[PDB]
Amino acid sequence: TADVQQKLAELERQSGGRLGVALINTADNSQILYRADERFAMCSTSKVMAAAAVLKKSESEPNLLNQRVEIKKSDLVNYNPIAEKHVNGTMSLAELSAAALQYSDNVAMNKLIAHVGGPASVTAFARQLGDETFRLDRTEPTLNTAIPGDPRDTTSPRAMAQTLRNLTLGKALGDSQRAQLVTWMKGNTTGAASIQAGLPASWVVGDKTGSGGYGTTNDIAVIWPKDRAPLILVTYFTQPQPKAESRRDVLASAAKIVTDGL
Ligand SMILES: *[B@@]1([O])O[C]([C]C([O])=O)[C][C][C]1[N]C(=O)[C]C1=[C][C]=[C]S1
Numbered sequence: 001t002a003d004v005q006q007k008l009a010e011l012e013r014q015s016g017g018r019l020g021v022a023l024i025n026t027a028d029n030s031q032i033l034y035r036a037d038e039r040f041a042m043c044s045t046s047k048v049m050a051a052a053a054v055l056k057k058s059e060s061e062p063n064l065l066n067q068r069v070e071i072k073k074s075d076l077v078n079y080n081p082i083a084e085k086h087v088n089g090t091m092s093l094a095e096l097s098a099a100a101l102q103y104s105d106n107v108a109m110n111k112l113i114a115h116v117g118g119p120a121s122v123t124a125f126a127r128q129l130g131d132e133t134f135r136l137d138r139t140e141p142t143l144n145t146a147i148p149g150d151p152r153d154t155t156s157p158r159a160m161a162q163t164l165r166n167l168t169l170g171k172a173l174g175d176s177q178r179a180q181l182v183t184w185m186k187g188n189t190t191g192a193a194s195i196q197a198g199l200p201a202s203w204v205v206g207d208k209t210g211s212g213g214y215g216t217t218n219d220i221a222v223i224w225p226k227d228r229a230p231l232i233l234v235t236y237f238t239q240p241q242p243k244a245e246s247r248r249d250v251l252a253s254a255a256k257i258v259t260d261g262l
């Protein structure tokens with residue numbers, strides 16, 4: 001408890017940056033919190049809320065996920081690993097959700113944002129869930145600038161852990177939609193060096209990463225440990241220098257520290 005706090009503080013100092021952690025353990029309703037009420041730039045971890053907003057919308061529009069969306073050269077941004085393969089064709093909203101969540105595709109994220117009515121609509125959805133901390137201000141790519149002191153496109157680790165718990169394990173979404181979100185997150189391709197890297201190989205993880213300005217390196221996860229109740233873990237990290245390098249190792253270390261001895 002105090003041991004874990006000290007270990008997180010030592011990791012943070014060694015890292016040179018600012019670390020935010022929230023773990024919810026659904027075994028006993030306990031938490032581990034470190035700067036859990038401070039704001040951090042979400043960066044690509046915000047893609048979970050945008051996909052969830054589309055899933056919510058689909059509850060009253062049962063054919064929504066099949067809807068076709070044109071991909072054009074004008075849609076391309078800075079990071080288009082899936083979308084660049086589909087220029088001059090269409091992708092379904094399901095495909096765009098999967099591309100955003102599993103490959104962190106920024107065009108896909110922009111199409112999800114646009115569909116549901118823009119960043120203020122994704123934010124209003126967060127409010128409807130009871131999350132009064134989340135704010136999505138901008139589209140891709142600018143939502144990742146992560147300037148220190150800038151509250152745009154931020155949330156707290158506590159808020160995001162509670163919200164992710166509600167989305168993946170609770171009743172924010174209908175059963176089909178929740179299952180789809182969990183399926184997409186379990187199939188993520190981008191997370192193996194982050195939270196997953198600090199957990200035993202046998203544990204099952206659905207996570208969403210993000211990388212941004214000021215070396216901002218983030219991951220949010222739902223975790224099914226071997227023969228245990230699930231966990232929700234948010235690890236946010238950001239650094240003082242604009243061109244700081246990614247530090248996914250810091251997220252792995254934080255994950256190890258807060259799950260040790262479970
Ligand atoms: B996102 O924050 O994270 C992605 C990688 C990941 O999931 O680990 C890549 C796309 C996103 N980040 C960016 O677009 C990078 C920046 C844009 C403006 C400043 S940094």
Ligand SMILES: [Cl-]
Pocket residue numbers: 199200201202
């Ligand atoms: Cl192992």
